[PDB]
Amino acid sequence: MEITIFGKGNMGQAIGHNFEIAGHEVTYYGSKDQATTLGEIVIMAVPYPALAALAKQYATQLKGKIVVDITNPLNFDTWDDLVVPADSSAAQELQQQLPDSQVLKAFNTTFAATLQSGQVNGKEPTTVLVAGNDDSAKQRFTRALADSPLEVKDAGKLKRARELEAMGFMQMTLAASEQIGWTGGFAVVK
Amino acid sequence: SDKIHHHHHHENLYFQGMEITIFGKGNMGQAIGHNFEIAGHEVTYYGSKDQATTLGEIVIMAVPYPALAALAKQYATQLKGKIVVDITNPLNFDTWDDLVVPADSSAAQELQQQLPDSQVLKAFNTTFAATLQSGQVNGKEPTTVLVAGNDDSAKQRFTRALADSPLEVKDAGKLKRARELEAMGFMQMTLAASEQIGWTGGFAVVK
Numbered sequence A: 001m002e003i004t005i006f007g008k009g010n011m012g013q014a015i016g017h018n019f020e021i022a023g024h025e026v027t028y029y030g031s032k033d034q035a036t037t038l039g040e041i042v043i044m045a046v047p048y049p050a051l052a053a054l055a056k057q058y059a060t061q062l063k064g065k066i067v068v069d070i071t072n073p074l075n076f077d078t079w080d081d082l083v084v085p086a087d088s089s090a091a092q093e094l095q096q097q098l099p100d101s102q103v104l105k106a107f108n109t110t111f112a113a114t115l116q117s118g119q120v121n122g123k124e125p126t127t128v129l130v131a132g133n134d135d136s137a138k139q140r141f142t143r144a145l146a147d148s149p150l151e152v153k154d155a156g157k158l159k160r161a162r163e164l165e166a167m168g169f170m171q172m173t174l175a176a177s178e179q180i181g182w183t184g185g186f187a188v189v190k
Numbered sequence B: 001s002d003k004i005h006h007h008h009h010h011e012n013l014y015f016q017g018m019e020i021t022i023f024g025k026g027n028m029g030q031a032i033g034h035n036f037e038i039a040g041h042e043v044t045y046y047g048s049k050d051q052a053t054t055l056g057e058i059v060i061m062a063v064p065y066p067a068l069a070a071l072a073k074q075y076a077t078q079l080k081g082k083i084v085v086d087i088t089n090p091l092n093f094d095t096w097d098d099l100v101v102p103a104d105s106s107a108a109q110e111l112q113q114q115l116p117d118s119q120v121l122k123a124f125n126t127t128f129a130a131t132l133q134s135g136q137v138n139g140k141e142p143t144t145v146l147v148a149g150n151d152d153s154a155k156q157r158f159t160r161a162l163a164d165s166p167l168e169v170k171d172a173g174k175l176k177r178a179r180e181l182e183a184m185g186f187m188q189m190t191l192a193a194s195e196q197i198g199w200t201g202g203f204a205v206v207k
């Protein structure tokens, strides 16, 4: 299928790498590029402050699409809070903004190097935790990554994006303090 | 040598360990106490309804969330100047879809407000009991305790009390980070409940 990735940075590239391995056609658009058409799955691999403006720009094309929010909405001035409500998430915000799209929270808990390599510092396979309201959307997303080296687990409904964002925040603060590194993180072990 | 034991990660040296009290004799309380025991410390266990005749330097509250306030109240004066560890995942068990503490807070922050002269830490809520008993995340990676708290010296003393155990211990930040720890614990529990992981696995912390 057609996968559209907004953001040609580290996450966009790492995410796209896995969809390409799985045999999909991946199209990338950076900040100075314009998209004429969008794929079935759209990855929002951009900074949180860019998310709402991007969703507005493609409001029409995003209707009926699986739209994946990968953001960790940290307050980057303080590193001591998120910039979304304590009982909510950037994904929930996006789903309200895109009522005709099936929004998924995914990849926010997997550091970019772990997506590129497919392993958590060479020790365990990398695992995507995907939250979203529609099971069919989660199933299609999961199927799209079947032939990639990534494991994929259903993290629940979109309400669980709160917990996913909390986990991403914790992971980043641990790596920032040098207690773990940025090629490691939280491995999901059965 | 009544309370003198060997300390495995201090070249097996033989010296008196710390006094640890664990409230809660369930799967978590027993697995946590197991690690303090193998680290060479003196561990005493009490159910929440038992009389705590002794209170150590570190007090583990391995009890349900609703029991925390009651224990804190009963021993508040006696807990002054002690390290008090909240291990809870304060779920709404009726729904399995919510926590029972405010969205911008944590059970540990509530406990710290109740016990202003205690050094409250959040620890063990992200480690399933089996991973504490074995010291490994389903035999694949070492188990890691994430400890949040305001007092760096208290976190250091807690970390030192586990240094002779098999567990890795990392500083998760100030007590405000208990919100994120509780979120992670909740998520881990729901993944096990859905059978996508088992109760002897979970989140391994990889450097």
Ligand SMILES: NC(=O)c1ccc[n+]([C@@H]2O[C@H](COP(=O)([O-])OP(=O)(O)OC[C@H]3O[C@@H](n4cnc5c(N)ncnc54)[C@H](OP(=O)(O)O)[C@@H]3O)[C@@H](O)[C@H]2O)c1
Pocket (backbone or CB within 6 Å): A006, A007, A008, A009, A010, A011, A012, A029, A030, A031, A032, A045, A046, A047, A048, A050, A054, A070, A071, A072, A073, A107, A108, A109, A110, A111, A112, A113, A168
């Ligand atoms: N890095 C990680 O390990 C990690 C892990 C989990 C989640 N995340 C999240 O992933 C997102 C991307 O992070 P990253 O590490 O990839 O950052 P990055 O390397 O800087 O990539 C982000 C890219 O998005 C581009 N961009 C900004 N606005 C855009 C727009 N309107 N349309 C298309 N592209 C746009 C930027 O382009 P320009 O440079 O030209 O401005 C930038 O290259 C963030 O929300 C972050 O929180 C990161």
